[PDB]
Ligand binder design. Structure first.
Ligand code: CA
Length: 553
């Protein structure tokens, strides 16, 4: 089995990880100086968010030069040094690949917009307006229409996201070749992995017809139904990945779960791993800034479906948080002071016992929570500016209604600076951080976590050790004991005769769990919030609030 199936990944959002020059923005030197921390945690590989030249209208995801490093993060030498220091520790690097769109400051686009006959014109999507308005009714994720009129030619260019993020035209052969040459440029450096940002929106619908009112409510799904999508992915694998030894993972956003196997089935030669969002958005409204209450039943049934989708030839990633979602403990657990540590450990047990490649987002091993936003001005996220444009200036909602709701969902919840210690600005920076540090850093910080064997960090470290020492916990089969149960999450991991039982109580009350008839406890690997391990040969468990545990049966 390939190294990535048993690897434990850590996601670094460099902007908010570690600053080393007091500009308030994290950088490469900051990450490099903190590799010993990540290695000590047990991390095998790191996925870093976009590190290329960018005007930062979407914090790295608007790339103006694919072959240069972002000025804020450092120089190419700093990148090479990061690579070298990762290799010295036997750690691998996964970089972010953003080729659904570029920055509008990219030289391709500057030339593209000059004229219709320009050699780079078809590097992007240019269209005439319709009936005195946009070419069609396409909305943008980041506000308003997905079409922006350029007075230079008088046509509209396409942007699923920010207006300064024009979509690249995958239908143009020379554009694809330029992207393939770009990928080689990073893979030649020894990059071990590539994460493909919104990989399913590469193919655009011919003719650009209007979206039906039904498609309007869920436009993200319509943008994933291009007819040439898998053709392009298969070609990219042929021209690039077939000649290297890097692992590929796709941010498969907007895609209906039934279409996922088309992306990750190894026989299809497209992608190796999938980032699905059925689980992480299982309690999010279609407008993306409201929360809809769910139960553990929904939680586990969603997981069960995603697992079945992987089948025998596909492979899933697993994560409870990233740079685009609220904090895991706040989202899936209970971040209240008396339950924060207990539930964070429970969620840790879940994360590192799933069938797939687990990804740990920075800060979650500390039990970092959502930020207490007080005003809309506390948000940096362009997406929130888009919500204000679409819902507040239109009179659909008040500023207070946006604030109250978006606080629970905003991407900025996960973008507050990593909390290293209790010094000024949690040891993230000596200057003023680009985004405010959570005031709870005095109680939640790496320095206190590391020195405490009962901390969230220590539990994370121990779990990573256990998963590494237990093959079944990674590539073993997955089976939910009772998908209808909304109190206690329980499942088994089995491989080569060895069967392991995971039991996680999601209630803040005592609960009792009964093993399947014929199953008995043979050994207790680890437990959180447990006063006593079960006796050898037990057929049931008495669980404390938010108690998690791994058992061999
Ligand atoms: Ca800096």
């Amino acid at each position: 089995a390939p190294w990535w199936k048993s690897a434990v990944f850590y996601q670094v959002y460099p902007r908010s990880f570690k600053d080393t020059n007091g500009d308030g923005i994290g950088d490469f030197k900051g990450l490099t100086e903190k590799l010993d921390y990540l290695k000590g945690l047990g991390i095998d590989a790191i996925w870093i968010n976009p590190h290329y030249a960018s005007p930062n209208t979407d914090n790295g995801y608007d790339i103006s030069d694919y072959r240069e490093v972002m000025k804020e993060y450092g120089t190419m030498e700093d990148f090479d040094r990061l690579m070298a220091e990762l290799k010295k520790r036997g750690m691998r690097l996964m970089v972010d690949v953003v080729i659904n769109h570029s920055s509008d400051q990219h030289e391709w686009f500057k030339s593209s917009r000059a004229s219709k006959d320009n050699p780079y014109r078809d590097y992007y999507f240019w269209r005439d307006g319709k009936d005195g308005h946009e070419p069609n009714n396409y909305p943008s994720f980041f506000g308003g229409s997905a079409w922006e009129k350029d007075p230079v030619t008088g046509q509209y260019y396409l942007h699923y996201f920010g207006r300064q993020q024009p979509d690249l035209n995958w239908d143009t052969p020379k554009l694809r070749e330029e992207l393939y040459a770009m990928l080689r440029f990073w893979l030649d450096k020894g990059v071990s992995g590539m994460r493909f940002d919104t990989v399913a929106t590469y193919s655009k619908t011919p003719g650009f017809p209007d979206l039906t009112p039904e498609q309007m409510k869920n436009f993200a799904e319509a943008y994933t139904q291009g007819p040439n999508l898998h053709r392009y992915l298969q070609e990219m694998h042929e021209k690039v990945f077939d000649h290297y030894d890097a692992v590929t993972a796709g941010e498969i956003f907007g895609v209906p779960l039934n279409q996922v196997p088309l992306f990750i089935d190894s026989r299809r030669k497209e992608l190796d791993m999938a980032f699905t969002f059925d689980l992480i958005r299982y309690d999010r409204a279609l407008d993306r800034w409201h929360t809809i209450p769910r139960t553990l039943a929904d939680f586990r049934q969603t997981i069960d479906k995603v697992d079945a989708i992987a089948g025998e030839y596909g492979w899933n990633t697993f994560f409870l948080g990233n740079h685009d979602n609220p904090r895991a403990v706040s989202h899936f657990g209970d971040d209240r002071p008396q339950w924060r540590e207990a539930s964070a450990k429970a969620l840790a047990t879940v994360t590192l016992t799933q069938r797939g490649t687990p990804f740990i987002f920075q800060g979650d091993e500390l039990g970092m929570t959502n930020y207490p936003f007080k005003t809309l001005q506390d948000f940096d996220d362009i997406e929130v500016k888009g919500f204000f444009q679409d819902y507040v200036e239109t009179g659909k909602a008040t500023a207070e209604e946006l604030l109250t709701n978006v606080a629970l969902t905003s991407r900025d919840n996960a973008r507050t600076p990593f909390q290293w210690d209790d010094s000024a600005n949690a040891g993230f920076t000596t200057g003023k951080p680009w985004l405010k540090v959570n005031p709870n850093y005095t109680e939640i910080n790496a320095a206190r976590e590391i020195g405490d064997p009962k901390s969230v960090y220590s539990f994370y470290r121990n779990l990573i050790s256990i998963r590494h020492e237990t093959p079944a916990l990674s590539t073993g089969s997955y089976r939910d004991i009772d998908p209808s149960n909304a109190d206690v999450y329980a499942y088994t991991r089995s491989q080569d005769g060895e069967t392991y039982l995971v039991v996680v109580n999601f209630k803040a009350e005592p609960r009792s769990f009964t093993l399947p008839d014929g199953m008995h406890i043979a050994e207790t690997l680890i437990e959180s919030s447990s006063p006593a391990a079960p006796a050898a040969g037990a057929a049931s468990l008495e669980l404390q609030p938010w108690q998690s545990g791994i058992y061999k049966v």
